Design an enzyme around this catalytic site. Sequence first.
Site, PDB file in Angstrom:
ATOM      1  N   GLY A 278     -11.904  -4.981   3.142  1.00  9.89           N
ATOM      2  CA  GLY A 278     -11.407  -5.826   2.086  1.00  9.89           C
ATOM      3  C   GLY A 278     -10.516  -6.888   2.670  1.00  9.89           C
ATOM      4  O   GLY A 278     -10.347  -7.953   2.078  1.00  9.89           O
ATOM      5  N   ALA A 279      -9.952  -6.583   3.835  1.00  6.31           N
ATOM      6  CA  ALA A 279      -8.995  -7.453   4.511  1.00  6.31           C
ATOM      7  C   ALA A 279      -8.445  -6.783   5.765  1.00  6.31           C
ATOM      8  O   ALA A 279      -8.473  -5.557   5.876  1.00  6.31           O
ATOM      9  CB  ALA A 279      -7.853  -7.806   3.573  1.00  6.31           C
ATOM     10  N   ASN A 282      -4.075  -8.612  10.429  1.00  4.11           N
ATOM     11  CA  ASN A 282      -3.718  -9.286  11.684  1.00  4.11           C
ATOM     12  C   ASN A 282      -2.425 -10.097  11.544  1.00  4.11           C
ATOM     13  O   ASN A 282      -2.345 -11.005  10.710  1.00  4.11           O
ATOM     14  CB  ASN A 282      -4.822 -10.216  12.163  1.00  4.11           C
ATOM     15  CG  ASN A 282      -6.174  -9.608  12.067  1.00  4.11           C
ATOM     16  OD1 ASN A 282      -6.580  -8.834  12.920  1.00  4.11           O
ATOM     17  ND2 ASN A 282      -6.913  -9.981  11.034  1.00  4.11           N
ATOM     18  N   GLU A 315      -1.573  -6.045   2.156  1.00  2.00           N
ATOM     19  CA  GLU A 315      -1.659  -6.671   3.461  1.00  2.00           C
ATOM     20  C   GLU A 315      -0.301  -7.227   3.948  1.00  2.00           C
ATOM     21  O   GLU A 315       0.018  -7.154   5.126  1.00  2.00           O
ATOM     22  CB  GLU A 315      -2.749  -7.743   3.438  1.00  2.00           C
ATOM     23  CG  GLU A 315      -4.111  -7.154   3.235  1.00  2.00           C
ATOM     24  CD  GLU A 315      -4.474  -6.266   4.385  1.00  2.00           C
ATOM     25  OE1 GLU A 315      -5.226  -5.284   4.214  1.00  2.00           O
ATOM     26  OE2 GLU A 315      -3.988  -6.563   5.487  1.00  2.00           O
ATOM     27  N   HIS A 318       1.789  -4.578   5.388  1.00  2.00           N
ATOM     28  CA  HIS A 318       1.421  -4.219   6.763  1.00  2.00           C
ATOM     29  C   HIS A 318       2.235  -4.974   7.840  1.00  2.00           C
ATOM     30  O   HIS A 318       2.438  -4.493   8.954  1.00  2.00           O
ATOM     31  CB  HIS A 318      -0.081  -4.452   6.976  1.00  2.00           C
ATOM     32  CG  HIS A 318      -0.929  -3.247   6.735  1.00  2.00           C
ATOM     33  ND1 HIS A 318      -0.500  -1.970   7.018  1.00  2.00           N
ATOM     34  CD2 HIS A 318      -2.195  -3.120   6.278  1.00  2.00           C
ATOM     35  CE1 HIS A 318      -1.457  -1.109   6.727  1.00  2.00           C
ATOM     36  NE2 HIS A 318      -2.503  -1.783   6.281  1.00  2.00           N
ATOM     37  N   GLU A 337      -1.124   3.275   6.782  1.00  2.00           N
ATOM     38  CA  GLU A 337      -2.000   3.068   5.630  1.00  2.00           C
ATOM     39  C   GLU A 337      -1.534   3.706   4.319  1.00  2.00           C
ATOM     40  O   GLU A 337      -1.710   3.121   3.252  1.00  2.00           O
ATOM     41  CB  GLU A 337      -3.428   3.484   5.980  1.00  2.00           C
ATOM     42  CG  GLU A 337      -4.088   2.572   7.029  1.00  2.00           C
ATOM     43  CD  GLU A 337      -4.274   1.140   6.539  1.00  2.00           C
ATOM     44  OE1 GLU A 337      -4.272   0.930   5.308  1.00  2.00           O
ATOM     45  OE2 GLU A 337      -4.429   0.231   7.379  1.00  2.00           O
TER      46      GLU A 337
HETATM   47  N1  LIG Z   1      -6.306  -1.975   7.721  1.00  2.00           N
HETATM   48  C1  LIG Z   1      -7.310  -2.519   6.803  1.00  2.00           C
HETATM   49  C2  LIG Z   1      -8.679  -1.856   7.004  1.00  2.00           C
HETATM   50  C3  LIG Z   1      -9.528  -2.511   8.078  1.00  2.00           C
HETATM   51  C4  LIG Z   1     -10.293  -1.472   8.891  1.00  2.00           C
HETATM   52  C5  LIG Z   1     -11.551  -2.060   9.534  1.00  2.00           C
HETATM   53  N2  LIG Z   1     -11.282  -3.274  10.355  1.00  2.00           N
HETATM   54  C6  LIG Z   1      -6.858  -2.370   5.368  1.00  2.00           C
HETATM   55  O1  LIG Z   1      -5.663  -2.468   5.110  1.00  2.00           O
HETATM   56  O2  LIG Z   1      -7.674  -2.140   4.474  1.00  2.00           O
HETATM   57 ZN   LIG Z   2      -4.104  -1.103   5.079  1.00  2.00          ZN
END
Ligand SMILES: N[C@@H](CCCC[NH3+])C(=O)O
Ligand SMILES: [Zn+2]
EC number: 3.4.11.-
Length: 869
Positions: A278-279, A282, A315, A318, A337
């Site tokens: 979904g995203a 980075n 995001e 994160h 997560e």
């Molecule tokens: N960390 C990402 C998932 C991406 C995993 C695959 N590149 C999220 O918050 O959903």
């Molecule tokens: Zn995530």
Amino acid sequence: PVATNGERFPWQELRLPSVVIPLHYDLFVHPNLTSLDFVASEKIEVLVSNATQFIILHSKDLEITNATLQSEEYMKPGKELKVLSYPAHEQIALLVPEKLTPHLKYYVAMDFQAKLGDGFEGFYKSTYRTLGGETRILAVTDFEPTQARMAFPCFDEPLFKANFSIKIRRESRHIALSNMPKVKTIELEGGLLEDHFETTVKMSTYLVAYIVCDFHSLSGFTSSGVKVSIYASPDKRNQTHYALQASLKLLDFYEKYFDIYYPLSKLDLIAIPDFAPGAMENWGLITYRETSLLFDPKTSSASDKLWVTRVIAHELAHQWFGNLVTMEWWNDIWLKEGFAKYMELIAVNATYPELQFDDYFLNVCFEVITKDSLNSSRPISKPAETPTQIQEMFDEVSYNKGACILNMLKDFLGEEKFQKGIIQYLKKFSYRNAKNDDLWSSLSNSLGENAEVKEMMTTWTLQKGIPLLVVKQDGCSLRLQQERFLQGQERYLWHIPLTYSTSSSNVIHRHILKSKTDTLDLPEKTSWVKFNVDSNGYYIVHYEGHGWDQLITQLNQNHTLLRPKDRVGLIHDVFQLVGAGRLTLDKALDMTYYLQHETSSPALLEGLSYLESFYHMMDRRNISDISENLKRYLLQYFKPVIDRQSWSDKGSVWDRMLRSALLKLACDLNHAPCIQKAAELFSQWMESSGKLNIPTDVLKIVYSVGAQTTAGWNYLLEQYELSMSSAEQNKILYALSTSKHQEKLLKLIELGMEGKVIKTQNLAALLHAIARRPKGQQLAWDFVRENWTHLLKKFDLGSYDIRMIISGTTAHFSSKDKLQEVKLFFESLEAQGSHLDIFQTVLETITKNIKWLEKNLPTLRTWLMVNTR
Ligand SMILES: N[C@@H](CCCC[NH3+])C(=O)O
Ligand SMILES: [Zn+2]
Ligand SMILES: *[C@@H]1O[C@H](CO)[C@@H](O[C@@H]2O[C@H](CO)[C@@H](O)[C@H](O)[C@H]2NC(C)=O)[C@H](O)[C@H]1NC(C)=O
Ligand SMILES: *[C@@H]1O[C@H](CO)[C@@H](O[C@@H]2O[C@H](CO)[C@@H](O)[C@H](O)[C@H]2NC(C)=O)[C@H](O)[C@H]1NC(C)=O
Ligand SMILES: *[C@@H]1O[C@H](CO)[C@@H](O)[C@H](O)[C@H]1NC(C)=O
Ligand SMILES: *[C@@H]1O[C@H](CO)[C@@H](O)[C@H](O)[C@H]1NC(C)=O
Ligand SMILES: *[C@@H]1O[C@H](CO)[C@@H](O)[C@H](O)[C@H]1NC(C)=O
């Protein structure tokens, strides 16, 4: 043992040696978007701890054409190295002609080159349709968790952090983005351009990102300086307005709440056409699917808005949870997560309390509860190895349960205290890694007697399942037994915090627990009690004695005497225990009577959700008699509220959500009126050649209706390609999956393979949709089963895509027969296929289905037939 062409490998474990420690990467990439490949050169400043003759790092489908190790003190520029490539561990070993020396800083430097990726991984190619109808290519990265190694060779563990200095070379037709802001741009001989980016703060490899594209942006500034920018197709810069507003509001909140400024000068969010997840969080360059980031008031609905708000929130969260403070290894992925999935709740309720995300949240939990109530479940924190296990790690457990038990934990500890708990945690690990335990410690330490919180969460994180807490009411003494909850064990114990109210005072009596069994007394004999108020706790309560009946009658009399989350929660457990075998179906169905009084859409919708669920079971299986009386019980009851719904977009979020809910239920069940009105709007919209505006709320409904004629279906697929709204397309495609013609659907599924008309990224979601419909449940199963070869070319197992293509097409089965053809297919999958834990889960689930039916089906028929009278 080793390879490739003869010669042996100095390191035989899949983890990397701690010896050679990476301090800084110089990273140059020259991608070509016509040639569709790139050439690259890197320079890693190492730092040996123990002398050694060979260096070990990762690499994958990278052709390395020059390997040197320069000296800073040993040797002047510069000695050449011998490159040993071991694929089955995606490693390469460097060979020195002279052992290195502890405590000395070297410079490993190589030149490599590859083609731009095929898939949704590493440094890959993606395209998009302009308003003119031009296809256009761009280059993008996705490195989580084990894919930075397909882009540039490196130490691809989340623990080896470093600074990153990226330089990108590009045509003037393109722009380059990367994590950090752009220092400068020089012109080159041939009119080529080279962009230099700020050196990154220390950070893990999987977070490095770079992109070449010709996108446009809307820029803005958080009150604390940062330049937020939303990047998208130039034809789509309009849909980027909400994204910007919310990013801004959210970053602002986060900085304050966490009390840690976001380090970077800029933060970009870009809407990648072709994007699997979904995203991706980075640092400073967050990638999104257009459907996660883009909003168009003409086509984007209540839910939509809420969801994009949601993933933007998740995001940005994160940037701290994961980015700043990175788990040491993929086992405690949950730390990144679950905390991000949680902060969703906080920040949105905080900034956008009108979205009312709270009343929703529980669903996050209810749904994990469904998967955690199996033996094929796992502990949020678990050992992880192959890249594939790591990927499997990304699931409802790590994400949702994680977010849930944290939430629970915050209840036991309180906001102000929990907030402090995390501010500390973050700061104590800024720019580094943290262990599972590390977090508990920093929390539980927010006289002279002790916060033993550790014990509590430690049982939660490290074992399977979810607790069921049966309660017995004998006057003023209540028996408490705690069991592992399952859906038709021995060795589980939970420090599960308790809560409960009484019919008397609406005050929250708390009380922990940490033994197989305990008891408690009640200050006054009372009508009923309700454990787990607001359902803030990750466990279930069973009410033996008249405990259950008492609560239910309370619901039919004055239900408002119950918390609306208690109501919601109750509904939930009732129907779950019916699956547990502890209750009988009539009891639950009988709860659903008070629903004609229920105005809390949360509950009203949840109740309705289950009734809805049963009809669908009945419908797939041919069970015409039940499904038709269920249709009738649904139309007749609820017809009050159903007929109260406006084909418009007015009201609060839940008011809109409820509207779409009901009006769908209605059209799905063939309520002549509705299905005629819907029919109308469509023929209108279509014959008005798109000019007419269907309200976003009824949008899917209309499209899905109009799709019943081959005339409409053919207009919608035609309409689908020209659309500029990721959101609209989504809905069209859905409406396309509501046809009853096999080939029609088949077509769709095939176009998903193709991936030119309907992007492959949708292939899973799409399949899942068709397998749901009675018509297509077979088609789908056939297809997946037949095409598992070519499917695995397009995706990875276990990519979330493959994982859901599997369950999405099988998890809904409920016959002995289907359960074999699956069982058998999973045996078959057992060369490269075997093994995904989903293989188990899928079966455990189909058994639960056959069972629930043979157990509770007869009960359904009589219960309904009873109403008819
Ligand atoms: N960390 C990402 C998932 C991406 C995993 C695959 N590149 C999220 O918050 O959903
Ligand atoms: Zn995530
Ligand atoms: C990738 O290679 C392409 C080939 O399509 C480059 O374009 C050719 O490059 C040379 C030198 O710039 C020019 O003389 C030609 O006119 C180009 N052909 C076309 C069709 O434009 C392009 O520069 C490369 N992309 C980049 C910037 O890395
Ligand atoms: C690599 O990254 C670090 C940050 O991770 C850069 O900055 C230092 O970071 C600390 C810790 O937050 C700050 O308090 C200091 O102000 C920074 N020190 C310096 C050098 O100013 C560090 O500069 C980067 N190193 C390289 C190789 O550029
Ligand atoms: C490196 O040195 C340290 C201390 O001298 C020691 O603990 C470790 O075993 C060494 N690493 C190896 C395995 O060579
Ligand atoms: C949600 O936000 C409101 C204020 O905006 C607050 O009263 C409530 O405590 C919040 N919910 C939680 C517990 O996060
Ligand atoms: C329950 O029902 C009564 C009358 O039917 C209503 O007036 C009353 O306010 C309700 N009780 C509460 C506390 O809401």
